[PDB]
């Protein structure tokens, strides 16, 4: 567990997140579901609340969604079953 | 056949599958790439296309 | 390359074998090929031994058959009656070496000399057998690999790629004469018929920029019009200057004006630069280049390029285009460069994508939208019953405007059939050196130039010279080609010059050294030929004495290394390194001709795939290796992206674009078009094809 | 894991995203407005453009795709020029030099997409070839030179240390590498003594540990002392905190195996940090270690001249025994062969033997950078032999080298060579790609789909056959046959009890421990034997090598199985009637009937061996009374 | 963050259109004097007379439906 | 513990080139402080030279004058090599004269105030008796080396020639130490540095730029606390 | 002229006495022409003190160990030279140790005169074990940057005083790179990232303090020679 801090890309570690999903197939589809969430989201605010909610943590000035949704799933926020 | 069909001989790979009534089964990498659906190897089988994404229940009260 | 596109002999076309057709049994080099045509000389990609070029003393029959010179030796003394000769009685007859030590009167010297046999056999035989001798060295060779010094120090790879390679340089705008060359460079010039050449002996009497006016013997006067920035056929310059003043007197035959690519009548093609081999700092890796600033600063490697765009005026359906000032609807201050009919003005600077001829098209008229109907009753226009089709600069390019060629059917010139009228517009940008852009030596040590630093943390000799250029040390042992070393050791010692000391006689070296190379002022010139060149000896010897700068100081010392400081740390490098002056052209495979993107634009018709090249915009063709590679990481969605929405599903890549711009999600793809056509032609076909559910 | 781009590139490649972002800046109210500042090129749309480029992946590719990393996903950053920046390590696994290749950029759209090209085709996620499991971004020649330059050791150096007491203490010992770097920076120390430091923030190999502090030597805070060079503490430092000192002379086989160990026992990030402090400190003592080529730095042998006149002398009496007559000209020719093969090594043993270490060449070669002694033969000693556009021997040959330089004949000879292996290459590219079709259609429905097919069968291991003195010698193929195989069945020495139980990855420690324990037969489980219906289960096919751990339940194993067989051609030479090249693999996946059709038995016992005239006719005796 | 045109600038499109049509007198005066602050007075004072507006605040002044105004009288009897 | 500070002294060998010793230092010194003073001599000297020049009968860079040996582009690869110095920053105009046959020499070119131009023996360009030349060209400030600034940056007409400038008036300066190091620890280094300048300045004004330039750059790091 | 953008300056920590600072932005170039000449004036300019010749009790040429001591004679002279300590005096300063019996010697055991200031009494230096006694002189004088050991010209001045390497300066290690940051707003300018790492006799930010008042003196003393000059001016904060 002990490195230099990651930067870009590549922040969260990969093996370190690897480590809430069985495989790596499975994490791709979690994110992106997640991150078509989010978008949404942020799209439909306007008026009144859809069924989606929210960026759990507290994102950057101008992040990107499936960088939030990374950070999300290793912030352990989310609970998923496949199918 | 529709894999077959790329090789050699697509008048007579066709001709006889049309007898036989010979229908696909989409369950190769060759065939889903010509019909332009997913593939059914990675990100394509249904372990891992069906997934349900949701936030759990003590975080949700922290929204 | 305009001379050697001429003596280029092929093997294909008709009444020839096509390149399928070509069994490797034909592209070998038959030992019958000894003069009669270069074994070095081929282009390298799928063409190799089909076309190959001349030699360079050879001759063509009355029947068509490729003759050769020989010297013809009687009876153990070489005479002077040189024969020609072919295939035939060369396989008849026994054929000596061309170096052959002759004892300076006829008589030759060892019994036992080298002799080509019949059936290309080498052997040894007593000197009287001996009927033909050769005329020259370097009568097996082609006229551009004539040029390269030091060839017999090559393998035959690196030559052939650095004799392909000496014919893609670019016409410079300094054009200096190499330090050190093979004596065939002249004749190269005054034979490719680039450069203006006296006629009749006589006295020039008015030079200009444009015109000569040589005053012969008796009476008549003779004028020589120049070609001043006249467009190549692939893009460059053709520019010819005056090398005479007022008053001297030249000769018939005399070079009398250079072209392109010449300095003072020889051949020219790229610059003398001061170059170190040793490896910097990762910035040369897989031989990259790295370059200093003064090459950009002081224009020391500057092409100029010239672009032609052409434009017309055909007549359609719905009446006659025009070329007018007026345009819809852009405002004037892109009329701000426009002339009074059209085309821009002369000396117009152009940047991306402006106006180069207004051009406005009859569309018709069609029906009209009832939102615009609202929007045109609010705003008041016109109803702009004309559809604009202006020549505009494509990507990237810029520079000056030099010449407006412009034809009409109205003003009795040769046209196709409804062109009224045909324009044609000239865009002249100087290029400077930049990265990205390709280099080479003469002995195909190529590479694109990797980061152009800054000039004072560039490493420099003893005396402040900072070096210009470093190759990288690793890609000279394992390609075999050392003439790059022992022609930049050369390159040094005829810098500097040279002194050789003859105190007490002549030193050891110096015995095959002729007069007169003996010693040489800083900065002369020699010449090496090709097979017959300096021995490492000389070499040697020359750099052991190499007369000093300005003060007491020799750079470098006899291994030909130098000690060089570091211009960014400030530390002297702990061992010494080669430096020396080697002799760099510049090649025409720059990157603006090679650098396109695609973002959305023009489609096919009969298919929907985007278009391809880069004359439009041009989208990459995605290859069935790269659907392997897709398909074996595992990356399902990026594949399918690839084959639906990108290329081919015309009714969802307009619902992407607008996903993209409102700021949405990016919708489901839809089922591609080439499965649909591919199922009307099943059904066509008398195939009950079905899809099934359940 | 960054890449370049051109501005004038990514601007056109992001325009969609740029007009969406500088709508909603209000710098275009709207679309067509968007479009002309961008076709017009304004100066906000750079600040525009870093803010919608940042953390958005783009692909890269280079023609000819061969194999799976082929294609491999970049972090893009901007770069003012016109050329595609890359990064130094990659250039391996890309197979692209530097003499004006292209790549060519693609970019994903949907948030699926750029999930795949984010976690999959990440560049800092591929490091180990699945081929073979040996890594793809270990650091290649230059920076090879440069920490071999560092981490070598010179007796007779600078400032060494020497025991040499009775008046004055050692004088080459130093407190700590600070120190050292102290001394080293003044004109007292060369990088490359031999000095004995007294390291804290460095763990001791594993003999000296157990020797000082037994088990519980916490690196992190203790102090031990080690004859080490400086160069060796400089380089250690850039491996990770917890991995043992080194203490060895950096050879690109103890690279290889040192980035092996490394990518087994830690993840991936601190692999890609690693190997990324490796290509740093490689370049910058690669450009201090003086490898420069001149020509005073190529020297002859000087015993040419004999060898030559020795040899010489027998081949003019083998021509003279031609000459009358006394044999046929094709032993003549193999007679002259046999004489100068056996010269051209002679010479290629005395040149070695004269050339020093620490010479550049010879520095290049023995590092492992690149390149062989044949071309080093062939640049100072003689080229040996060319062939003929047959295939034949010349049997001239050539007596030259080209620092001498050649003759005209000789050049003449050599250029069939030359223009022989310039098509042939070609030649090979094509047909290379062909079998990689083959293979591909063939094993494209091979993909992972259970767990556990759950059967007992499976194939047998060789592994270390005993020595008939009776020892463990380790047999030479075991990485290629043995590792990274799930156990069938258990392992148990002698009626003992079991070593390793079914279902063990089977790797270097397993290996260990049972060549200790004393055996050779395991019976590992593996496909061949997987008892699925269409596909295999993923505990038969093992470890995939690509991740270090087992595969998971979608992979396209054949497609990686293809590409990993049908990458390695290009470098499959024949030979100098039965065929031993890359058409032998041809013949063989196709199954054809060999040419050189030897037979084989049909029943044990004795055999009659009975040639008759020309060509031989053996009959077998049976034991069976058949 | 903007560096757009004028448009904020401009003090036609500041607030409320529906103010520039006031059924007061009063109520337009505020929406009159607000052009006194604007760049583009003789243009849009120029394209409102020759278009013939029949109505509203138009380059700082109201129109009639025909023509200039000085300013409309209220509902009522005229004063002296 | 050495009790001195070091002392620069001077030496002057021509007109236009000079040297400069500094004596003592520490050990490991000298060469970065030579090296230091290189890179700042090298690339930010302010100076001053031609920037844009406009000929009366040409109207772009690539055609040629009526009666000129050379051409346009062969006159601005003449007109690159000139020395000129300016004192005021703004953009002052000086004017070339020539008509009939002769030589067009650099000492032709008649300034205004201010400016001055170094070198009038410089070959530009020659005449026959047909030719006329009348040439404008404008003088900045600066520093560096800056590429050709366009034509539409500024709003000029079609006749206004833009020519990328180098103004820095110093040339090659190199520098060499000699280590004392003895055996008693009485080790210092000696800084032997030795400019040359392209005859605008002297060499000693180039070095007292440098200087300056370091100083004021190093008061930042001074000025932390 | 104006050097168009003000280079600023913030430090960290990572240590009680490990900063990182970082100057941004500069001029392109300058922050290779800056960065080497702040790294070597900072390890070669500041003054400190060190340990220049030890003398030792029983030991005068058998330089194997030390009786009554477990530890080696070079462990002793290698642990002694990394102490931490300053001076006032110019002259070479004496100091003396005593102890005697089973124990532990720490670097508090030494007694200090007048002006010389340990900075850690707590760091072990010697295990005197079964009833020995050590009786160390230590030679203490204040210096600059590193020298190596004096060889012992005044051989016949003492038999026994051996002399040792000192390191001078307070501080120990610093790196430093560059990077490229605005090619294209601000023109590729350049980033400097320090790293220095002392020993806690000062503080990193008064050690770059010194480091930048020893560096501007050096250039003005090549600026005070045509103060009438012109150059780049930054201006105020
Ligand atoms: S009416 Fe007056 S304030 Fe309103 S937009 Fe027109 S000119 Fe401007
Ligand atoms: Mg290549
Ligand atoms: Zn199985």
Redesign the interface.
Same mark, same amino acid.
């Given at each position: 567990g002990g490195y230099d801090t990651p930067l870009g890309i590549t922040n969260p570690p990969i093996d370190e997140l690897l480590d809430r999903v069985s495989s790596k197939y499975a994490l791709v589809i979690y994110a992106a579901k997640r991150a078509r969430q989010i978008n949404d989201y942020y799209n439909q605010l306007g008026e009144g609340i859809l069924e989606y909610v929210g960026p759990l943590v507290e994102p950057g000035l101008q992040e990107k969604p499936l960088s939030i949704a990374l950070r999300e799933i290793h912030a352990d926020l989310l609970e998923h079953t496949e199918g | 056949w529709l894999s077959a069909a790329s090789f050699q001989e697509t008048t007579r790979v066709l001709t006889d599958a049309a007898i036989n009534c010979r229908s696909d089964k989409l369950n190769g990498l060759k065939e889903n790439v010509i019909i332009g659906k997913l593939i059914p190897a990675g990100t394509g089988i249904n372990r891992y296309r069906n997934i349900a994404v949701q936030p759990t229940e003590e975080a949700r009260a922290a929204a | 390359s305009g001379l050697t596109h001429k003596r280029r002999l092929s093997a294909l076309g008709p009444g020839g074998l096509s390149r399928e057709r070509a069994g490797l049994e034909v592209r070998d080099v038959h030992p019958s090929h000894y003069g009669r045509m270069c074994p070095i000389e081929t282009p390298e990609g799928p063409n190799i031994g089909l076309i190959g070029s001349l030699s360079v003393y050879a001759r063509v029959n009355p029947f068509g058959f490729i003759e050769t010179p020989y010297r013809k030796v009687v009876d153990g003394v070489v005479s002077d009656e040189i024969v020609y000769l072919t295939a035939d009685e060369e396989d008849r007859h026994v054929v000596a070496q061309a170096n052959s030590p002759i004892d300076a009167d006829g008589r030759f010297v060892e019994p036992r000399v080298l002799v080509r046999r019949k059936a290309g056999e080498v052997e040894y035989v007593p000197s009287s057998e001996v009927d033909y001798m050769d005329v020259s060295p370097r009568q097996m060779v082609s006229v551009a690999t004539a040029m390269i010094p030091f060839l017999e120090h090559d393998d035959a790879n690196r030559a052939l790629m650095g004799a392909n390679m000496q014919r893609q340089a670019v016409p410079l705008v300094r054009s200096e004469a190499p330090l050190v060359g093979t004596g065939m460079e002249l004749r190269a010039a005054i034979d490719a018929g680039d450069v203006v050449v006296a006629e009749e002996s006589g006295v020039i009497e008015e030079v200009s920029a444009d015109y000569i006016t040589v005053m012969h013997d008796n009476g008549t006067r003779r004028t020589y019009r120049m070609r001043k920035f006249a467009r190549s056929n692939h893009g460059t310059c053709a520019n010819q200057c005056p090398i005479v003043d007022a008053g001297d007197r030249v000769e018939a035959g005399q070079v009398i004006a250079d072209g392109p690519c010449t300095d003072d009548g020889e051949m020219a093609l790229g610059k003398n630069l001061l170059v170190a081999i040793m490896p910097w700092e990762g910035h040369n890796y897989e031989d990259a280049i790295i370059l200093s600033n003064r090459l950009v600063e002081e224009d020391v490697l500057t092409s100029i390029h010239i672009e032609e765009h052409e434009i017309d005026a055909r007549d359609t359906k719905l009446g006659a285009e025009e070329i007018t000032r007026d345009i819809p609807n852009i405002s004037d201050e892109v009329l701000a460069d426009l002339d009074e009919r059209g085309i821009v003005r002369i000396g117009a600077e152009v940047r991306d994508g402006d106006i180069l001829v207004g051009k406005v098209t009859p569309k018709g008229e069609t029906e009209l939208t009832p939102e615009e109907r609202l929007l045109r009753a609010i705003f008041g226009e016109k109803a702009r019953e004309v559809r604009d089709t202006s020549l505009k600069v494509p990507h990237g390019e810029s520079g000056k405007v030099i010449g407006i060629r412009v034809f009409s059917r109205e003003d009795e010139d040769e046209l196709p059939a409804g062109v009224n009228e045909l324009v044609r517009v000239y865009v002249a940008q100087k290029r400077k050196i930049s990265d990205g852009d390709k280099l080479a030596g003469r002995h195909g040590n190529k590479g694109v130039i990797g980061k152009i630093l800054p000039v004072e943390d560039m490493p420099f000799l003893a005396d402040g010279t900072p070096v210009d250029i470093i190759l990288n040390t690793h890609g000279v042992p394992r390609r075999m080609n050392i003439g790059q070393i022992l022609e930049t050791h050369l390159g040094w010692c005829a810098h500097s010059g040279w002194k050789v000391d003859a105190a007490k006689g002549v030193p050891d070296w110096a015995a095959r050294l002729p007069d007169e190379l003996l010693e040489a002022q800083p900065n002369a010139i020699v010449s090496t030929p090709v097979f017959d060149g300096a021995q490492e000896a000389e070499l040697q010897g020359l750099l052991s004495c190499t007369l000093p700068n300005r003060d007491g100081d020799v750079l470098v010392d006899a291994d030909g290394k130098a000690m060089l400081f570091d211009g960014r740390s400030g530390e002297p490098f702990p061992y010494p390194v080669t430096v020396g002056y080697m002799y760099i052209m510049k090649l025409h495979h720059l990157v603006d001709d090679k650098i396109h993107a695609r973002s959305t634009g023009p489609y096919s018709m009969i298919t929907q795939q985007p278009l391809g090249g880069k004359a439009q915009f041009g989208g990459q063709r995605f290859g069935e290796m790269e659907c392997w590679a897709m398909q074996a990481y595992g990356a399902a969605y990026t594949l399918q992206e690839l084959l639906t929405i990108k290329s081919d599903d015309t009714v969802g890549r307009v619902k992407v674009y607008e996903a993209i711009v409102k700021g949405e999600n990016i919708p489901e793809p839809g089922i591609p078009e080439s499965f649909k056509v591919l199922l009307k032609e099943l059904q066509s076909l008398c195939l009950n094809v079905e899809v099934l559910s359940s | 894991?960054?890449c370049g781009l051109?501005? +004038?590139?990514a601007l056109?490649?992001f325009?969609?995203?740029v007009?969406?972002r500088l709508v909603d800046? =209000?710098?275009?109210?709207n @679309?067509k407005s968007a479009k002309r500042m961008v076709?017009?090129?304004r100066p906000?749309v750079?600040?525009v453009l870093e /803010?919608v480029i940042?953390?958005?992946?783009v692909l890269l =590719?280079r023609?000819?795709?061969?194999?799976?990393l082929?294609?491999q996903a970049f972090?893009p950053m901007?770069?003012?020029?016109? #050329?595609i920046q890359l990064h130094?390590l990659v250039?391996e696994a890309f197979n692209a030099?530097?003499?004006?290749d292209?790549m060519?950029?693609?970019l994903?759209?949907? #948030? /699926?997409?750029?999930?795949?090209?984010? @976690? +999959?085709?990440?560049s800092?996620?591929n490091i180990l070839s699945p081929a073979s499991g040996r890594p793809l971004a270990m650091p290649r020649?230059?920076?090879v030179?440069g920490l071999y330059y560092l981490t070598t050791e010179v007796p007779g150096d600078t400032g060494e240390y020497q025991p040499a007491?009775?008046?004055?203490?050692?004088?080459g010992?130093?407190?700590?590498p600070? /120190?050292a770097?102290? #001394?080293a920076?003044?004109?007292?120390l060369s990088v490359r003594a031999k000095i004995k430091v007294?390291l804290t923030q460095l763990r001791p190999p594993v003999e000296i540990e157990a020797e000082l502090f037994g088990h519980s030597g916490w690196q992190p805070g203790d102090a031990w002392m080690a004859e080490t060079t400086l160069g060796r503490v400089m380089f250690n430092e850039l491996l990770?905190?917890?991995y043992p000192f080194v203490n060895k002379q950096m050879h690109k086989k103890v690279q290889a195996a040192i980035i092996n160990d490394l990518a087994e026992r830690y993840?991936? @990030?601190?692999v890609?940090?690693t190997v990324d402090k490796l290509?740093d400190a490689g370049?910058?003592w690669?450009?201090?270690?003086? %490898?420069?080529?001149?020509?005073?730095?190529?020297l002859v042998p000087p015993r040419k001249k004999e060898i030559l006149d020795h040899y010489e002398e027998r081949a003019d009496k083998v021509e003279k025994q031609f000459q009358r007559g006394a044999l046929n000209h094709d032993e003549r020719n193999e007679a002259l062969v046999e004489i100068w093969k056996e010269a051209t090594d002679e010479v290629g043993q005395a040149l070695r033997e004269h050339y020093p270490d620490d010479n550049? @060449?010879i520095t290049? %070669?023995d590092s492992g950078?690149?390149?062989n002694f044949t071309?080093?033969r062939?640049?100072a000693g003689m080229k040996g032999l060319v062939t003929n556009?047959k295939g034949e021997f010349i049997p001239?040959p050539v007596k030259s080298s080209?620092?001498?330089? +050649?003759?005209? +004949?000789e050049?003449?000879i050599?250029?069939?060579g030359?223009?022989?292996?310039?098509?042939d290459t070609?030649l090979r590219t094509a047909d290379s790609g062909y079998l990689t079709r083959r293979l591909?259609?063939v094993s494209?429905?091979v993909?992972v789909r259970e767990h556990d097919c759950q059967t007992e069968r499976g194939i047998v291991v060789e592994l270390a056959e005993r020595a008939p003195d009776g020892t463990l010698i380790r047999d030479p193929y075991i990485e290629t046959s043995a590792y990274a195989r799930t156990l069938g069945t258990d392992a148990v020495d002698e009626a003992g009890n079991v070593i390793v139980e079914r279902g063990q990855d089977l790797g270097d420690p397993e290996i260990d421990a049972l060549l200790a324990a004393g055996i050779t037969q395991v019976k590992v489980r593996s496909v061949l034997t997987c008892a699925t219906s269409?596909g295999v289960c993923a505990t038969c096919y093992g470890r995939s090598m690509a991740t270090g751990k087992l595969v998971?339940?979608? /992979?396209?194993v054949g497609?990686?199985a293809?590409?990993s067989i049908g990458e390695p051609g290009t470098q499959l030479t024949m030979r100098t009637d039965i065929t031993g090249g890359l058409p032998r693999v041809q013949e063989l996946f196709e199954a054809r009937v060999p040419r050189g059709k030897a037979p084989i038995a049909d029943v044990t016992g004795r055999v009659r061996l009975e040639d008759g005239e020309r060509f031989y006719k053996i009959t077998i005796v049976p034991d069976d009374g058949g | 963050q903007t560096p757009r045109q004028r448009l904020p600038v401009l003090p036609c499109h500041v607030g409320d259109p529906d103010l520039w049509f006031a059924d007061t007198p009063a109520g337009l005066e505020v929406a009159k004097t607000l052009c006194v602050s604007c760049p583009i007075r003789r243009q849009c004072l120029a394209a409102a007379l020759q278009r013939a507006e029949p109505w509203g605040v138009w380059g700082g002044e109201i129109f009639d439906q025909g023509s200039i105004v000085s300013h409309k009288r209220p509902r009522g009897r005229p004063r002296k | 513990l050495i009790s001195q500070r070091p002392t620069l002294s001077e030496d002057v060998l021509t007109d236009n080139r000079s040297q400069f010793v500094i004596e003592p230092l520490e050990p490991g010194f000298g060469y970065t402080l030579g090296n230091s003073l290189r890179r700042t001599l090298l690339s930010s000297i302010p100076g001053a030279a031609v920037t844009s020049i406009r000929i009366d009968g040409v109207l772009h860079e690539f055609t040629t004058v009526p009666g000129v040996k050379e051409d346009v582009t062969e006159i601005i690869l003449n007109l690159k090599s000139l020395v000129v110095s300016s004192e005021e920053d703004e953009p002052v105009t000086m004017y070339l004269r020539k008509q009939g046959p002769g030589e067009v020499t650099a000492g032709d070119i008649v300034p205004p105030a201010g400016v001055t131009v170094h070198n009038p023996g410089m070959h530009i360009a020659t005449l026959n008796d047909k030719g006329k030349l009348e040439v404008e060209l404008v003088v900045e400030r600066g520093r560096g080396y800056v590429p050709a600034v366009q034509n539409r940056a500024s709003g000029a007409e079609i006749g206004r020639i833009p020519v990328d400038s180098i103004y820095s008036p110093v040339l090659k300066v190199t520098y060499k130490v000699d280590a004392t190091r003895v055996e008693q620890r009485t080790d210092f280094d000696k800084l032997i540095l030795d400019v040359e300048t392209k005859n605008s300045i002297s060499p000693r004004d180039a070095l007292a730029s440098a200087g300056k330039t370091l100083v004021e750059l190093f008061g930042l790091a001074r000025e932390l606390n």
């Open positions: - | - | - | 894991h960054q051109p501005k +004038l590139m056109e490649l325009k969609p995203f007009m969406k800046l =209000n710098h275009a109210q @679309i076709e017009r090129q906000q750079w600040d /803010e940042a953390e958005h992946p =590719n023609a000819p795709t061969l194999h799976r082929g294609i972090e901007l770069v003012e020029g016109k #050329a130094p250039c030099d530097f003499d004006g292209q060519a950029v693609h994903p759209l949907s #948030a /699926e997409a750029q999930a795949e090209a984010r @976690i +999959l085709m990440l800092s996620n020649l230059d920076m030179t007491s009775g008046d004055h203490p050692e004088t010992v130093y407190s700590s600070a /120190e770097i102290m #001394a920076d003044r004109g007292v007294r990770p905190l917890g993840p991936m @990030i601190v890609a940090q290509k370049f910058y690669a450009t201090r270690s003086g %490898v420069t080529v001149s020509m005073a730095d190529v550049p @060449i290049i %070669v950078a690149t390149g071309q080093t062939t640049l556009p001239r080209f620092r001498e330089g +050649l003759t005209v +004949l050049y003449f050599n250029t069939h030359a223009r022989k292996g310039l098509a070609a591909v259609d494209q429905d993909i269409t998971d339940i979608g /992979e396209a497609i990686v293809a590409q | - | -």
